[PDB]
């Protein structure tokens, strides 16, 4: 019965969850954690990564 409200609630929740999970992606980089990139590679390469 209350489907039209749960619809938008679940849509917003899924949008937020996907926006959070997108942080785990690397986008071709070596790691998703930026602190690891800062601590391992030199700044000239850390900026590019």
């Amino acid at each position: 019965a209350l489907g039209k409200l749960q619809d938008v609630v679940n849509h917003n929740a899924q949008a937020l969850n996907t926006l959070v999970k997108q942080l785990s992606s690397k986008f071709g980089a070596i790691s998703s954690v930026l602190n690891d990139i800062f601590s391992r590679l030199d700044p000239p390469e850390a900026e590019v990564q």
């Binding site: 602190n35 690891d36 800062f38 601590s39």
Partner: protein
């Protein structure tokens, strides 16, 4: 012993470092300070800046 520089024998050693989530065994010569638990502090627990 009488050859060009482009054909002289070499001796290469490759070092592989595993960054997987595991208890660290090989570390750096850096020391270790005390530990506080009630304030914003920068931790360096062998894998995290």
């Amino acid at each position: 012993p009488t050859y060009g520089v482009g054909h002289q024998p070499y001796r290469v050693v490759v070092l592989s470092f595993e960054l997987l989530h595991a208890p660290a065994t090989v570390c750096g010569p850096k020391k270790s300070t005390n530990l506080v638990k009630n304030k914003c502090v920068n931790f360096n627990f062998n894998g995290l800046k």
